[PDB]
Amino acid sequence: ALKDDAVLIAARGYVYTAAVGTAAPTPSQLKLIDLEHPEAWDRTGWDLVGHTSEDDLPEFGFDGGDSEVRGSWQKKKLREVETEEIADYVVINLTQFDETALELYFGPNQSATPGIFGVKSGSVVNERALLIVIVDNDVRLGFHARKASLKREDAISLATDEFGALPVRATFLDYQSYNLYEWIEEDWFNAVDAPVVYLLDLGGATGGDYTLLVGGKSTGDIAYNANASAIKTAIGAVDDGVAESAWTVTADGSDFEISGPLAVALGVDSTTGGSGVTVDVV
Amino acid sequence: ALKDDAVLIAARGYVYTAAVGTAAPTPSQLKLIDLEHPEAWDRTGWDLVGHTSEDDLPEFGFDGGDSEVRGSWQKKKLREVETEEIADYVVINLTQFDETALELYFGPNQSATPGIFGVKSGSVVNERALLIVIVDNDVRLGFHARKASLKREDAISLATDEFGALPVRATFLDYQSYNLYEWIEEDWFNAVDAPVVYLLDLGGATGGDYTLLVGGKSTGDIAYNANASAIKTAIGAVDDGVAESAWTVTADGSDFEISGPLAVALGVDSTTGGSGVTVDVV
Amino acid sequence: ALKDDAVLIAARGYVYTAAVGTAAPTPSQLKLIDLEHPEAWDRTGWDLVGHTSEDDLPEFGFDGGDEEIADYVVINLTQFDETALELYFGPNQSATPGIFGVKSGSVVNERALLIVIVDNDVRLGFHARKASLKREDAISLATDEFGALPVRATFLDYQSYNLYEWIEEDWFNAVDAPVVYLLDLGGATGGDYTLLVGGKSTGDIAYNANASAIKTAIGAVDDGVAESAWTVTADGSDFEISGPLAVALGVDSTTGGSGVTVDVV
Amino acid sequence: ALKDDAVLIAARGYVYTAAVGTAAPTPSQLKLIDLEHPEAWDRTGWDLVGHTSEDDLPEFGFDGGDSEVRTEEIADYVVINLTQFDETALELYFGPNQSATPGIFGVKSGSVVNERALLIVIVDNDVRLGFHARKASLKREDAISLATDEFGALPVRATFLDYQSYNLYEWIEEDWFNAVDAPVVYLLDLGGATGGDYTLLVGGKSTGDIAYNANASAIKTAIGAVDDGVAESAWTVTADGSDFEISGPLAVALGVDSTTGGSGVTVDVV
Amino acid sequence: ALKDDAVLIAARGYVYTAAVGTAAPTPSQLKLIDLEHPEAWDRTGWDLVGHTSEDDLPEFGFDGGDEEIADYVVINLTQFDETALELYFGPNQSATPGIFGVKSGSVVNERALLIVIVDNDVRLGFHARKASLKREDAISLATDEFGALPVRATFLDYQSYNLYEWIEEDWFNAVDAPVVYLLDLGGATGGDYTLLVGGKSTGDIAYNANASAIKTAIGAVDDGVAESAWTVTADGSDFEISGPLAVALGVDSTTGGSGVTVDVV
Amino acid sequence: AGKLPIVGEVVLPILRGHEDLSNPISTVPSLAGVHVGTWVEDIDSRTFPLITVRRVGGTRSPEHPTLFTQPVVEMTAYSAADLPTTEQMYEDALEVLYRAARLQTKTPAGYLHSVTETLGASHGPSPFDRTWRVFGLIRLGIRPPKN
Amino acid sequence: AGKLPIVGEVVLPILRGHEDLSNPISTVPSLAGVHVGTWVEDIDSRTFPLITVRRVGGTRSPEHPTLFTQPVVEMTAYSAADLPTTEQMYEDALEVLYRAARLQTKTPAGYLHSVTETLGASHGPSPFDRTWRVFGLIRLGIRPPKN
């Protein structure tokens, strides 16, 4: 079907790397994190690859994919066979000459000396997890590969009125039972029917001092004499990246409907009236 | 990491040669030495190759590096392997025709009569250490190879309205225990990590209040006030998703060096009753 | 005949060995087992051999011709683990950690062998109760391609079993039931339609025609024996047709519906 | 099954020779030795054969017979393409130098006996598959090749021979062959409860002296700093409610003990 | 040991012949003689064979192995005047000016043979006291490439001399001299330096350290080898180091007349 | 997706620093107090400094005309102070447009997608008594306001 | 690191030979006593010889707009002496820019990174009584100051 908000014009592309197998931000975190400071994220281990030419994007590519139709002298077309299976890659033109930019291109520094970066002869093993985030509009199509081999795509480019650049090709390789790579966007892939709601029960009103965890992070605690606005302010004050304005909470007397940008569950339970005010189900 | 001052545009490139194995100037000397006069500097033995053109630079390249993805009947895309050994080189267009600039291109002259340079047929061995200094404002990214084999890259260019040129290709080779080549710059390679700090400039006891952005989101209004926890817990808890324990603020004297995972800035200053809270600068 | 379904490309596959006489998974298990982890099979006893070569796949050769043939398989291994050296050199002759030792002269080396060739969800299996394992030729080594240990498995008779089985539930000893074509008229509200049989059109069939009238409308020019080569039987609103020639829709001219046939091959 | 870790590319490698019967480095030394300097090893007597051609790797062939009906004798060789032309490579191709004068290498008519131990180490990004033969007989495989644009080569065939009831040849790595079910953990005794000092030995050499009361980090500092190629960080150690414990890349043994009271200290492994 | 300077490219070469048993230039002459003009040599008696092809350089083949080995060289001559026809056909059997005549067969044609292979500086010689020269193959002719007369020289024993000898002063029966790394302090007047030994780093060495202080800093290096293996004798402002590993400049801080030390051997 | 805006409903909130369209005085700290508009007021009303942004070309994209557009805007800075202050005020306007593009800045009317110069800052004659003009052409990309 | 300046804060100290922006007469040996500035003073204050620098175009660099820019300046030399002195003075000023670029000259507002003519020393009509004029366009390139 046609979707005017799934049409994409990549405006800027951030690129991050980490040790092999490192997990990317989940689809619901990718809408809330900032892209400029990876040391702030929940998924520690990622860091920015460096500056990239800001009129250009990470250049996807492949080689192989050479495929042709085959048959028998009875029936002339019956399969298309892929003769050389697709080897899939992305090219990244760093413009930095910092050590942490050269290590993507040359592999690890071979000298201990302050102020020198040394290169040895022969091939190097150099492979990383790779996360790319492509930004347009308020969209953030992420891309994640758990293992990519990094190699020099071409020699270092220097020019008298265009920035110096050192291009790496990251080639994707499969790793354990995981996928070759994954695209990350919560609105587009495996999407639910639009609303989700959690029903916080209230029938156990003899009560106590229970609490919620929201996206895994605690709200402190809430007393049994609860109110829809009071629990919206409690949930909306969890320090997780998203404000009280994003949450919708309403009542049907015996329970509250809770809804918003993140998962909600009960943490520590404390109540006299059995399960009746410590139930939170979808 | 996204450091700006490591981004390079090559303004001009000086090229020097010496007998095989000769050491380059040290990383701290490279910031002080006078590039026009290599006979004068501490690291004796280097000389300028001649007039290279003003509008182009020593051009890096490599042969080989043809690389392929391999597997097995069980598992495809197991590892990437280099099918041809990568062979780094630099091309230099000397525009100068005296004996010292022909000797790099033809090898040593095989005639001893005054006023003649003569060449024998066939191969020649013509090998030198090579130092290139690429200059950009105060950045002086050096490049050093202890042995390079220097060969004819193309025939002598002559043109009616463009300068004549002797293009040499320097190919890098292993010389005893040393690296193949080394990049030299004291501030960039093997240097200390130098973590970012943001200077909260409040000019002492003052009337009124100001605001701070943390990660691009405003905290509340801050008056002239006590430091320590009373500023750290105003920098933290901005619905930023980062706990206060990630930040530091310290007994810094007059003006305070904020640090933590997000960037910080001022939003507005209304602290009008004296010297004010005028800057936030790194 | 002409099973387009049963044309094989060996796109991926696996090789297992076990003690002599070990039974392979049954044809209905082979459709369902996990090939990476033979330790988890209900038909337990099989050890997965190392990475076999990507381009030199197993060669199912034989030596004789007319004296009597011996069947073999040549398998290129591409791994230097003990699990692969044991197939090329025979059992390890040293007990010390970190060493694999070879004695001179011939050594007896016999194992059961299972090979699975996957394509896309078909999984043709091959199984031999007893193979004798030999060095095919030299260890290959190269600077730019995986080193290889090629082994010859020669099949030997064992305890009145076959030399080898080919294992696949769909293809061997199947029921061989004939194809049937479904004349799904859809809404069928009025009008006319024509089939074509072997490429020739039937010419006229009313929307309300019964199975016998359809069986008489089939029997076009160049037919098999008109009303006894062809079986037509109703179910629901529709008819299953079968006989000696292919049947297809020629021209739907009916007054309402989403189609006029759905057809087996 | 399916170690992808054990798929081998022969990216670089080194060929060595020695007098017949001489031993190669053990599986736990081969991870640590410097391949370019065989005079530095614990197993003295190896010398480097010269530069060998970058494209014709060693062929581990054989010329044995084929049988399928129920005629199968076999002999094993390896062919090495030497590319140096100085004496250390000509002695493998032609046999020993039969002229005594400086600057000349001379060869006589007929066959000559030329038997050596052979070691080959094949290297792939800190994988190091070793191969060792106690006795090989060396012969000319075919002509010396000369070319205008490519290095000349002397192809020599080493044929393996039985020797003194050792194996015909052996492949070496600690991680792949006869590998341990779990990493070895040594237990260090405390039954010598009081006073004085002791000296462990690691990989066959003394730790120096260490006191009865020593902390686990002092024990780690002692075993991690004693005359062989394993770094301070290679070892992991703990002191527990009744015993001390050591783990790492080498054999550890109780050495010599001068603990003043209790049983003295003597325990092996978990 | 590994010797880069002993790897051979046959970039140019020269082939000479002479009466049976004649001696070659000695190793110390072979580096100095002029190869184009063999009548000028002090070790006189050698005639230059003329041109030999650039493709198909002479190959040092053999026949036999496992019956006894017979050694040979094939030389592809490319001149067609008398000094090259005399090797392919044997001596001229006509006396008249301008004719070279060939008799029916079985000529005897023995000569001494010397080959010099010339790299950019290395000049490996090969010498045989007696060789028997024979046709290896047909005369080649082409419209666009030089014709050739390939001759098999087969080596034969003579008066208890060797079959043949390789001649090079630097390479064969040379002195066993150990590697000796210099260590030049560069006129240092303060600070420290470190040595890389193998790939490991020493601790800090002070600019004024004596030979014993260097010995105990080169040992105790998270060692491959004991202090006892290293020799570190001074000879002036410098030290000469020898031992079982490589030694290199590492990191230094010396503040004197040169801002670095150096280790160049 | 909503309709594409006129270019003034996106560029002006980026240069002013607020999305109240009724108030032309900027609050962005690098050029605060500059009057930013599309049409120069009567002499009894106008105040200097002044920035004028004026549509001078640039089509919808041919790939999808209703999804992305690339207006060309002539941007002009005026002052009564001196020529250097008029240059620095134009530079301080580029430094805001390039930052607002780097973030994909949202506005009620649309998103500023990208910014590029087709003719850089240049000095010219001014139509107003004792003032200096500096001007250039920016081509800037716009996207619909979701919804 | 720093911010890119208005072009006058880079080339005027380089043509003048001093970092004092308040003192418009140059002290460079080839231009001793030439007045150098963006704007021609009133007739009661003009002195000749005179050089003027005006920005005429040239963008920020498209791939890092905050890190490099290539302003085109019109440079114009005026004299009351004669036409040869005017084109000599223009060549003697252009020789200072080509040297100051080769030396990567640091100025308190930025570095002159490169120089390139795009029209050379054209003679033209002067707007001032009894004076000669020669002019050309130079595409400069400038980098922000380190901090």
Helix/strand/coil (H, E, C) string of B7-57?
A: ECCCCEEEEEEECCCCCCCCCCHHHCCCCCCCCCCCCCCCEECCCECCCCC
Question: On the CB side of E121, how many CA atoms lie within 13 Å of its CA?
Answer: 7
Task: Write out chain C in H/E/C secondary structure.
Answer: CCCHHHCCCCCCEEEEEECCCCCCCCHHHHCCCCCCCHHHCCCCCCEECCCECCCCCCECCECCCCCCCCEEEEEEECCCCHHHHHHHHCCCCCCCCCEEEECCCCCCCEEEEEEEECCCCCCEEEEEEEEEEEECCCEECCCCCCCEEEEEEEECCCCCCCCCEEECCCCCCCCCCCCCEECCCCCCCCEEEEEEECCEECCCEECCCCHHHHHHHCCCCCCCCCCCCCEEEEECCEEEEECCCCEEEEEEEECCCCCCCEECC
Reduced to 3 states (helix: H, G, I; strand: E, B; else coil), residue B145 is strand
**G94 touches G76 (CB < 8 A):** no
Reduced to 3 states (helix: H, G, I; strand: E, B; else coil), residue D54 is coil
**C249 touches C258 (CB < 8 A):** no
Q: Beta strand E192-193 with E205-206: parallel, antiparallel or unpaired?
A: antiparallel
Which residue type sits at F146? K
**F86 touches F132 (CB < 8 A):** yes
Closest alpha carbon to B200 in B246, B239, B250? B250
Name the β-bridge partners of E13. E117
DSSP code for A26: P
Which residue type sits at D73? E
- DSSP for B161-189? SS--BEEEEEEE---TTS-SEEEE-TTTS
Distance from CA of residue E22 to its chain's centroid?
22
Residue D1 tokens read as 């099954």
Collect all residues with Cβ–Cβ distance below 8 Å to A61 and sequence separation of at least 6.
A88, A89, A90, A91, A169
Closest alpha carbon to A186 in A24, A31, A2? A31
Residue G142 tokens read as 């400038």
How many Cβ atoms sit within 10 Å of the Cβ of residue F44?
Answer: 5
Task: Write out A71-114 in H/E/C secondary structure.
Answer: CCCCCCCCEEEECCCCEEEEEEEECECCHHHHHHHHCCCCCCCC
Distance between CA atoms of residues C169 and C9, nearest Å: 18
How many Cβ atoms sit within 10 Å of the Cβ of residue C166?
Answer: 14
**E218 touches E230 (CB < 8 A):** yes
Distance between CA atoms of residues A27 and A142, nearest Å: 8
Distance between CA atoms of residues B138 and E253, nearest Å: 24
Interface contact flag, G70 A160, Cβ < 8 Å: no
Between the alpha carbon of residue E51 and those of residues E86, E125, E148, the distances in Å are: 14, 18, 10
Q: Do chains D and B touch (3 or more CB pairs under 8 A)?
A: yes
Length of chain B: 282
Distance between CA atoms of residues B159 and D169, nearest Å: 68
**G41 touches G31 (CB < 8 A):** no
Distance between CA atoms of residues D155 and G28, nearest Å: 74
Distance between CA atoms of residues B32 and B75, nearest Å: 56
Collect all residues with Cβ–Cβ distance below 8 Å to C141 and sequence separation of at least 6.
C147, D8, D10, D57, D58, D59, D60, D122
* Contacts of E199-205 spanning 24+ positions with Cβ under 8 A: E199/D34, E201/A112, E201/E250, E201/E251, E202/E250
Reduced to 3 states (helix: H, G, I; strand: E, B; else coil), residue A155 is coil
Distance between CA atoms of residues C263 and C243, nearest Å: 13
Distance between CA atoms of residues G112 and A254, nearest Å: 74
Max Cα distance, chain G (Å): 48
Search chain G and give the residue with CA nearest B134: G104
The Cα of E251 is separated from the nearest Cα of chain A by a number of Å equal to: 6
* Contacts of D33-40 spanning 24+ positions with Cβ under 8 A: D33/D229, D33/E224, D34/E198, D34/E199, D34/E224, D34/E245, D35/D121, D35/D123, D36/E2, D36/E246, D37/E198, D37/E244, D37/E245, D37/E246, D39/E244, D40/E198, D40/E224, D40/E225, D40/E244, D40/E245
Distance between CA atoms of residues A18 and A104, nearest Å: 11
Where are the alpha helices (H) located in D105-224, listed in sequence order? 216-223
Length of chain D: 270
- Crossing angle of helices G8-16 and G83-102, in 10° steps, is 110
Query: G9-42 burial string, b = 16+ CB within 10 Å, else e?
Result: bbbbbbbbbeeeeeebebebeebeebbbbbeeee
The Cα of F72 is separated from the nearest Cα of chain A by a number of Å equal to: 18
Choose the mutation target among A20, A120, A121, A123 for the interface with D, i.e. most D CBs under 10 Å.
A123
Q: Specify burial of residue A52 (Cβ count, 10 A radius: 0-12, 13-18, 19+).
A: buried
Distance between CA atoms of residues D112 and D89, nearest Å: 16
Choose the mutation target among B74, B77, B85 for the interface with C, i.e. most C CBs under 10 Å.
B74
- Stated as kind and residue range, the H or E segment containing D107 is strand D104-107
Reduced to 3 states (helix: H, G, I; strand: E, B; else coil), residue D16 is strand
Name the β-bridge partners of D138. D158
Question: On the CB side of F48, how many CA atoms lie within 13 Å of its CA?
Answer: 17
Residue C40 tokens read as 């988890």
Closest alpha carbon to B63 in D176, A152, C228? A152
Between the alpha carbon of residue C257 and those of residues A63, C240, C252, F84, the distances in Å are: 47, 19, 10, 79
**G18 touches F62 (CB < 8 A):** no
**C198 touches C245 (CB < 8 A):** yes
Instruction: Please provide residue G102's backbone torsions phi and psi, each rounded to the nearest 5 degrees.
Output: -60, -40
Chains that touch B (3 or more CB pairs under 8 A): A, C, D, E, G
Which residue type sits at D211? A
Strands (E), A3-82: 12-18, 47-48, 59-63, 67-70, 79-82
Distance between CA atoms of residues E233 and E243, nearest Å: 12
Chains that touch G (3 or more CB pairs under 8 A): A, B, F
Choose the mutation target among C139, C146, C154 for the interface with D, i.e. most D CBs under 10 Å.
C139
Distance between CA atoms of residues C102 and A178, nearest Å: 39
The radius of gyration computed from the CA coordinates of chain F, to the nearest angstrom, equals 15
**G123 touches G17 (CB < 8 A):** no
Distance between CA atoms of residues D119 and D38, nearest Å: 11
Question: On the CB side of A123, how many CA atoms lie within 13 Å of its CA?
Answer: 26
Query: B62-95 burial string, b = 16+ CB within 10 Å, else e?
Result: eeebebbbbbbbbebbbbbbbeebbebbbbbbbb
Closest alpha carbon to E66 in B253, F131, D141? D141
Q: How far apart are the first and last CA of chain A?
A: 29
**E35 touches E116 (CB < 8 A):** yes
How many Cβ atoms sit within 10 Å of the Cβ of residue B121?
Answer: 5
**What is the dihedral angle through the alpha carbons of A206, A209, A210, A214, rounded to the nearest 10 degrees?**
130
**C131 touches C113 (CB < 8 A):** yes
Instruction: Please provide residue D141's backbone torsions phi and psi, each rounded to the nearest 5 degrees.
Output: -80, -55
Distance between CA atoms of residues C183 and F89, nearest Å: 79
- Stated as kind and residue range, the H or E segment containing E86 is helix E82-88
Contacts of B4 in chain G (CB under 8 A): 1, 66-67
Distance between CA atoms of residues E86 and G120, nearest Å: 76
Where are the alpha helices (H) located in F1-147, listed in sequence order? 8-16, 83-102
Distance between CA atoms of residues A104 and A168, nearest Å: 7
Q: Specify burial of residue C55 (Cβ count, 10 A radius: 0-12, 13-18, 19+).
A: exposed
Closest alpha carbon to F114 in A136, G70, A35, A4? A136
Reduced to 3 states (helix: H, G, I; strand: E, B; else coil), residue F101 is helix
Q: How far apart are the first and last CA of chain G?
A: 6
Question: On the CB side of D258, how many CA atoms lie within 13 Å of its CA?
Answer: 8
Nearest 5 degrees, angle CA E252-CA E257-CA E259? 25
Choose the mutation target among A4, A31, A56, A57 for the interface with F, i.e. most F CBs under 10 Å.
A4
DSSP code for A157: B
The Cα of C108 is separated from the nearest Cα of chain D by a number of Å equal to: 12
Residue E203 tokens read as 């601790």
Edge to edge, the sheet with strand F110-124 lists F35-37, F50-57, F72-79, F132-143, F110-124, F106-107
Length of chain A: 282
**B169 touches B59 (CB < 8 A):** no
Between the alpha carbon of residue D107 and those of residues C254, D145, E17, E169, E176, the distances in Å are: 101, 18, 20, 17, 22
- Stated as kind and residue range, the H or E segment containing D255 is strand D252-257
**B223 touches A132 (CB < 8 A):** no
Collect all residues with Cβ–Cβ distance below 8 Å to C225 and sequence separation of at least 6.
none
**E244 touches E233 (CB < 8 A):** no
How many Cβ atoms sit within 10 Å of the Cβ of residue E116?
Answer: 20
Q: Do chains E and F touch (3 or more CB pairs under 8 A)?
A: no
Distance between CA atoms of residues A222 and A218, nearest Å: 11
Q: Which residue is it, tokens 């025979």?
A: C90
Query: G95-124 burial string, b = 16+ CB within 10 Å, else e?
Result: ebbeebbbebbbbebbbbbbbbeeeeeeee
Name the experimental technique.
cryo-EM
Residue G3 tokens read as 């911010």
**C64 touches C202 (CB < 8 A):** no
Closest alpha carbon to A143 in A167, A170, A125? A170
**A71 touches A77 (CB < 8 A):** yes
Instruction: Please provide residue E228's backbone torsions phi and psi, each rounded to the nearest 5 degrees.
Output: -65, -20
Nearest-by-Cβ selection for D178 from C83, C96, C146? C96
Query: B161-189 burial string, b = 16+ CB within 10 Å, else e?
Result: eeeebbbbbbbbbebeebbbbbbbbbebb
Max Cα distance, chain A (Å): 83
**D201 touches D207 (CB < 8 A):** yes
Distance between CA atoms of residues B86 and G37, nearest Å: 54
- Helix, strand, coil content of chain F in percent (nearest 5): 20, 35, 45
How many Cβ atoms sit within 10 Å of the Cβ of residue C58?
Answer: 19
Distance between CA atoms of residues D212 and D215, nearest Å: 9
Interface contact flag, B263 A123, Cβ < 8 Å: no
Distance between CA atoms of residues A117 and A97, nearest Å: 11
Search chain D and give the residue with CA nearest C39: D1
Residues of A with CB under 8 A from a CB of G: 51, 53-56, 95, 160-163
**D147 touches E10 (CB < 8 A):** yes
The Cα of D33 is separated from the nearest Cα of chain E by a number of Å equal to: 8
Reduced to 3 states (helix: H, G, I; strand: E, B; else coil), residue B254 is coil
Which residue type sits at A109? N
The sign of the CA dihedral G106, G107, G110, G115 is negative
The radius of gyration computed from the CA coordinates of chain D, to the nearest angstrom, equals 24
Nearest 5 degrees, angle CA C46-CA C50-CA C53? 125
Distance between CA atoms of residues C130 and C159, nearest Å: 10
Q: Specify burial of residue F126 (Cβ count, 10 A radius: 0-12, 13-18, 19+).
A: middle
Between the alpha carbon of residue C141 and those of residues C57, D7, D9, D31, D61, the distances in Å are: 18, 11, 7, 21, 11
Distance between CA atoms of residues G89 and G75, nearest Å: 12
Q: Do chains C and F touch (3 or more CB pairs under 8 A)?
A: no
Distance between CA atoms of residues G30 and B59, nearest Å: 36
Nearest 5 degrees, angle CA G124-CA G128-CA G130? 85
- Helix, strand, coil content of chain E in percent (nearest 5): 10, 30, 60
Closest alpha carbon to D239 in D258, D214, D259, D263? D214
Q: Specify burial of residue D261 (Cβ count, 10 A radius: 0-12, 13-18, 19+).
A: exposed
Distance between CA atoms of residues E212 and E227, nearest Å: 10
